[PDB]
Amino acid sequence: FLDYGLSEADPDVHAIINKEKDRQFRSLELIASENFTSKAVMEAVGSCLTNKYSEGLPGKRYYGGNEHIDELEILCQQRALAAFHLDGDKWGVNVQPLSGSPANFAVYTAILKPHDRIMGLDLPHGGHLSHGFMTAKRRVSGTSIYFESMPYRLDESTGVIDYDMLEKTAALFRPKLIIAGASAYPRDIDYARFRKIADSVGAFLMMDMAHVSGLIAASVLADPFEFVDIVTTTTHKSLRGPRGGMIFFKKDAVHGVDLESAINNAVFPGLQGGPHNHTIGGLAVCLKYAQSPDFKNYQNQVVANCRALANRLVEHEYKLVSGGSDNHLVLVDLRPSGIDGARVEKILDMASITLNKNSVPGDKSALVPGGIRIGSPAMTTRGLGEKEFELIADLIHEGVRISLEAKSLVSGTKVQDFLNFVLAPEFPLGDKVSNLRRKVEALATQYPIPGV
Amino acid sequence: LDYGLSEADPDVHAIINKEKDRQFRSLELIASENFTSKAVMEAVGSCLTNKYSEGLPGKRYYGGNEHIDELEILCQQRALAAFHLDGDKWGVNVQPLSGSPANFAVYTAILKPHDRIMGLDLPHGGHLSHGFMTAKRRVSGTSIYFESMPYRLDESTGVIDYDMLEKTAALFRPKLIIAGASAYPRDIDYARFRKIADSVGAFLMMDMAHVSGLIAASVLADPFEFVDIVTTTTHKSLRGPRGGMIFFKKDAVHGVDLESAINNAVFPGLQGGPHNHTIGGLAVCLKYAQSPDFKNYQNQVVANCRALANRLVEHEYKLVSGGSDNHLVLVDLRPSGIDGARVEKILDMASITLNKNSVPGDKSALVPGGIRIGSPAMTTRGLGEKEFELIADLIHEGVRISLEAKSLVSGTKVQDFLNFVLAPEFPLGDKVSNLRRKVEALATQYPIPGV
Amino acid sequence: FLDYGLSEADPDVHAIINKEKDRQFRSLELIASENFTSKAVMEAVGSCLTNKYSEGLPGKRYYGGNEHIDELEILCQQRALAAFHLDGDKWGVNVQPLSGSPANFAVYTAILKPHDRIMGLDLPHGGHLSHGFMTAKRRVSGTSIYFESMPYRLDESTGVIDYDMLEKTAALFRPKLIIAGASAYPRDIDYARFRKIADSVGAFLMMDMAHVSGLIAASVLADPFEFVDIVTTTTHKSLRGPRGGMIFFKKDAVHGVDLESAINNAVFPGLQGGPHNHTIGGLAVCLKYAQSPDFKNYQNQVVANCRALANRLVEHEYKLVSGGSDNHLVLVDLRPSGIDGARVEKILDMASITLNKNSVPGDKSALVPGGIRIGSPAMTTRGLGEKEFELIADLIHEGVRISLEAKSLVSGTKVQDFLNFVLAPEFPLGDKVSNLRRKVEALATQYPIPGV
Amino acid sequence: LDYGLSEADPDVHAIINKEKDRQFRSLELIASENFTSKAVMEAVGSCLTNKYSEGLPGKRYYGGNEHIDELEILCQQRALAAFHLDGDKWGVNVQPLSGSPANFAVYTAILKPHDRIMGLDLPHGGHLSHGFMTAKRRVSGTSIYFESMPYRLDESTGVIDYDMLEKTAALFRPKLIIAGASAYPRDIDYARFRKIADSVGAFLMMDMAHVSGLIAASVLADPFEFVDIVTTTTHKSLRGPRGGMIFFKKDAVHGVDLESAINNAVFPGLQGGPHNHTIGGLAVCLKYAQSPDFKNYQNQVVANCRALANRLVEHEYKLVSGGSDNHLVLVDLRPSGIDGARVEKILDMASITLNKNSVPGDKSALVPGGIRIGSPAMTTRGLGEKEFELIADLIHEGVRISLEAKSLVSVQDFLNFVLFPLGDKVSNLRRKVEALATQYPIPGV
Ligand SMILES: Cc1ncc(COP(=O)(O)O)c(CN[C@@H](CO)C(=O)O)c1O
Ligand SMILES: Cc1ncc(COP(=O)(O)O)c(CN[C@@H](CO)C(=O)O)c1O
Ligand SMILES: Cc1ncc(COP(=O)(O)O)c(CNCC(=O)O)c1O
């Protein structure tokens, strides 16, 4: 009967999407985990695929009516293996996980018993919550509730994974699973050394490639599939797809375990219910694109842009964690500047520069992020080049100077006092912020943005 | 160059068109399925997908969340409004990725590993996420991480066995009792669940996934009058995007601050970045959920199911519990001389899509004794009571064809039935075609929502 | 060098031991778990066997110097088997458990994983703490901390194990281990029924015979070894041995498990260190006696004496749980007598009769036990026969009468109002308690007490 | 009928007399052994064994325990005085049946299942009860119900690597850190342990099983100055009966009432009836432990061990950590070119009883590269420093025989061959061994 378009069915939600669309258009989106997915992905995601229940696997379902859903799921699997240059007799893939966090949890449920041991990169050193996180007070991450996690750390003087200390701690702790891959690690991973450490204790070895999956597909970074047993990823970051997840696994037995059975059973019936076939349609689209020469070019540009930005930030005298980057991000250490990342993040956000505060090695308190994380994928997608990334670094720097100036004016010491002060109409640096914003937007609006 | 899907990926475009077709010309009777709206689809296929927004509105871990926050706030208040809830008494988290993670997040919030849980037994119409163990394996993640024990229907009445639940709860001492089901054809006695829960100091939760739209429109009783926590999928009877929600009391329950424990279990506990495109779609469906049209829809859903239920009875089918108060029937096929698996397959060949389902009394999990049939999806397309009677007839014809096919197969292993019916010399293909003709003739008289 | 005897080395301890010896002598010891062990047992226990570390098993020890400890432990093992008429090719035994509770915990450790499911007789219905016990509000026994226990119960009227209900709850609960055996149960156990119920869920089946081991060995009660997988026991109580434990196990695989290796490994290196070879010495000695015609005699006397007492109590109109007993104990339901076990136990204690207050099926309050448990083995060891046990029944009866009269004089229903009443100098029933005590000590002091 | 043991059971009588003769004539050098007194054996071999006393003094299940209560109370106040403890600040539970259950009761009292524990690694002289896992199995029950990770010695010094424990404790976040060990020749830096425990909010426990007598006599440092909980065996250094004790602060520790928790874990948590015969002997041994004579014996323990160590140095053996502060030495036998397993059997055949013990640096933990040797037992019998120098020579002689025995063999085949040409040298060693030992008294009944 009536089936209005959005602008008619819900004018308020329509208006919100248009405001977000305009914010994306005019901003420098520098969140390392964000990207702009294509019109074609969004169209697959916003289709009738959302209507189908298809619990199980292709050909192996608990409902009728899944002929076309099976075709899509098979295609998406083939494309996943193709994008990562994988032999299908050696590697399988499950494309049903709903996001990165549940793809990881499904792996643990597949190969680990409750309270089995896991090692991942420490959260304050650039790791991800889903690999484990405990404070003195509480088990924060669900992974640390259901499993026993102990982190490994960077060498704080170099910003590089302290592989020698991991060698020793692994031997004492006896993890059943060692996880490589990170949220805010600016260097490539020594997969061979992980393999040697994992073998020293008979551990399973996994790479979580959520941040760098597109770079790996394009052969810009080293291939984790040469060394690891299991690879997890999100589909929304460097891969530039819909919000979702994937798990890849060896098909030959690993420590006597059939990883394919274990992982497919953990995803379903273990942890999830019906697959989101709309998300799978978008994933298939992005995985086609991931095989193209343009994508390889794009990913090489991501790294070149991040290098141009890193080099300019160094020229503005910023300290980078690890001294630089091999990938799509940099982590800036703002302690020498004398300001935290939460204050910087806000000022920059007010000038249309969106990044995130990020902890830094050496931070005294997790409640106070000492740095900022900046990535090139999103703005690279829009067509910015090396020179424009140098300008981004200059605009970031203007914003930090403004952050420092605004800090000096605030009475109270809480972040909430800063936020109230800087958002107040009578904020004295309103002109400096509006001036910066105009420059930020003048750059951003020169470029196209993908999407519907 | 940012091509449309037809140009960017014609192979995926083609598959989507085939599925649009299949939906158009089939009778979709899966009780958990529905056809979501064009407006929901437009929201889900928007630029909201691009944003990382960990945390909660105005308490985020990233910059740039002004409009994302507006949306999530609007989504929450529409959630509460759609269920007629006072926001001083009830809170909501709209970020869960689906039904299964909503439920796992609640367990994570209020239980410790190995704590005791009771939920409706899987073969008596329950859900895996509420606990399932066979003799030799813990199948559900709920039964890996927690200690589960089911409760059951009374097989003579097809109604939940409240008297037995009262007794088993007393012995097992669950910390959490879960009401709600996937294939239960009646309303739930919330007052009796509350009494049983209080009898052991257990948390009490309702999983309203299948029935949330009927509860919203006040067609079934209100769980929120009695339980502590309500979970749901945003798909199914709510007719939204694929996602989930968790509602909770704000007054402390057995001393626990449920708002804090639940929000923290969702993030940072179990999930990362919220799916804001899904949250957009959810907001759209929650607006619609408050409309008089949606109320009309939900009453039609019940009337359509009852019309189908009666005609199956006229064809002498046994229904679990003798009928239905809601959107579904569970057909006990044992007295028709055939299992659900054989029937599901033949019906699917005829463009009638439903599912095989366990029936209480089944001597074996591996042979489902019934089929579950639902009205929401075809009701959304505009079918009425007479049309549901015709559906009942077509199912009957299909079950007759299934019996005839079973007669011709040596093994009566299932794989044998399948090979037989799928072979090109399958001798009943004309009967399946003839049925299929009648099925599509009906379905293709009706519009279907979406982009 | 001055290695004095106890009288000189430690006069205070010597004096305490002597006072205890005299208390034992002038008292009627009717606690059903108690006995008087022999002089020969006490000599082995108080020997230089205490000096040796012998971690491991015979011929497979971590230390040197164990030729003679080996001989002893090998001999203890073959006497344990022989006393229970066990074929060594079907049954093995570990004689190192430090007591009854460590014996049971070693079995759990052997055959279960943490949080596995166990069913045992409910503590308020006469089971033991070590088989599982939880209040609404806490996990009291170690077994309920480390494992998931659910009790089964007696029938409220018959006094008997409600086998039918156990059939149904084990079906639902799916325990991995079912434990038969009780601390305060007056009937023999239907072992064939426990086997059927066990098999219906694939559970291991265990008997804890601590209270009845002597009766089983003398073939007075039915043989659990015909039907169960594992039997545990204390070496004290019914066996009249030193304070220790043993575990017996099938040597054929049970549900795919090698119990011998599992159980032995659990005991050592799992849970215990150096065996207490002095105690194994005393155990060997009691097991020789356990095979003797005099022990078989004594055990039939234990049952006859308990029946004599029971019958005389029924003449005095007392109600017995299950209307009687097939074993060494009787459980008196005092609810129809109008008084509880705690008031009765206390009066009886004031008159040198030691028994214990006991919960009865139906009791409203765990704080107010409705009964008393009475046992014959200790006094039967001293040489009492049936006519003496009939006299014991009359002495108890007089104590109940005194207890009733004391209750009627105290206005409180508060138990400490009762205690204050009975302990006051002006306590009106002082001469009645003195009179009863005279008769009690007059009976008791006619019989010897074994020991050094 | 109630015969004596020689009449009741001649075969057990005969075995006990053989074991008595073996103890009398041998050099008993197992570091964990001692010879307890006639007075302890008499208390342990008493009517005390008959009584059920579930609970605590005045707080029992059953009646008839007036004398059992008096006994336990006295035992507790002797335990506090033997270790110079203020009873307002410290309590003790004297019911644990041995060292292993004492420890497990502490874990049960203060930890939840799967909570984290760190103790000295087993191949580095630790104890099973503190945790032990291999690649393929959780060997200790401690490692099944709880999550253990070890800490290690610095292999170049033979001392605990406190810097490494500092770092690994920060990563692993143990809820309990355990100090104390079965084969560690040095005193412990309790102040450092406290510092490390505090860095992660952990409970800190000392297991003083091997060194309690030395601590009571003030020969080694006092753990009670720094730790929350002290467990011990009562055999070993303290020279008592076979049992355990747990000491605890009575001031709240990280908001835990340790007294209530530990008492409840012992009973009703894990054990039943106390072994009052054993508490009797313990009480006797704790009176002796307060005396001037005990203090002299413990100083003699340390002097004797130093005499042996220094003679084994003259004979050019390597000692793990370069000596000892205590009652034991750990000899590194790899530079002598033979393992501890072969040496142990040959020494035992000549009536020298010690044990094979791993060395920091073993390649396979199937092959111990060393031996542990202790002075407590022979010190109790009256031996001085000259005799421990003679013991050192006798061990030396037996090692030379073990090498020559290994030379005549070409791998448990060593045990086929010895059980023989070298019988004469084994027997000649034995004669001198037994000639030294039988010159001294032995305590006991
Ligand atoms: C290595 C890794 N693995 C898994 C995930 C989880 O993905 P999800 O947010 O889709 O659950 C992330 C997300 N990472 C987000 C969270 O900060 C980011 O902005 O970096 C990740 O970095
Ligand atoms: C520190 C510590 N804690 C606990 C125990 C266990 O005491 P138990 O054997 O009485 O259980 C020991 C015994 N240790 C034995 C093990 O070989 C020994 O010979 O040293 C111990 O050394
Ligand atoms: C009661 C109930 N709860 C939770 C879920 C899980 O929803 P997800 O599949 O999105 O995780 C379901 C799905 N049940 C599937 C069906 O009835 O067909 C359900 O029926």
Author numbering:
A (entry chain A), C (entry chain C): 82 to 533
B (entry chain B): 83 to 533
D (entry chain D): 83 to 492, 496 to 504, 508 to 533
The paper states:
SHMTs are α-class pyridoxal 5′-phosphate (PLP)-dependent enzymes which transfer hydroxymethyl of Ser to – typically polyglutamylated (polyGlu) – tetrahydrofolate (H4PteGlun), producing Gly and 5,10-CH2-H4PteGlun. Here we report crystal structures of a chloroplastic SHMT enzyme from the model legume plant, Medicago truncatula (Mt), which similarly to At has seven SHMT isoforms. MtSHMT3 is a member of the α-class of PLP enzymes, and its overall fold is typical for this family. A subunit of MtSHMT3 can be subdivided into three regions: N-terminal arm, large domain, and small domain, consistently with other SHMTs.
Soaking with Ser the MtSHMT3 crystal that grew in the presence of PEG and 150 mM ammonium acetate allowed to capture three snapshots along the course of reaction, killing the metaphorical three birds (intermediates) with one stone (crystal). The three different stages, within the asymmetric unit containing two tetramers are: PLP-Ser external aldimine (chains A and D), PLP-Gly external aldimine (chains B and F), and PLP internal aldimine with free Gly (chains E and H). PLP was bound at a partial occupancy or absent altogether in the chains G and C, respectively. Importantly, the reaction proceeded in the crystal despite H4PteGlun was not present in the crystallization milieu. The presence of Ser leads to the formation of Ser-PLP external aldimine, which changes the conformation of PLP moiety. However, creation of the covalent bond between PLP and Ser forces the rotation of the plane of the PLP ring ∼20° outwards from Nζ of K318. The side-chain of H292 is actually flipped to interact with the carboxyl group of the Ser moiety, salt-bridged in turn to R454, and H-bonded to Oγ of S114 and Oη of Y144∗. The complex with PLP-Ser external aldimine shows its unique conformation, with the PLP-Ser γ-hydroxyl group hydrogen-bonded to Y144∗ and synperiplanar to the PLP-Ser carboxyl C atom. This lineup, whereby the hydroxyl of Y144∗ also interacts with the PLP-Ser carboxyl, suggests Y144∗ as a potential base in the H4PteGlun-independent retroaldol cleavage. Y143∗ is shown to adopt a conformation ready to stack H4PteGlun in the states wherein the cosubstrate is needed in the active site (PLP-Ser and PLP-Gly external aldimines).
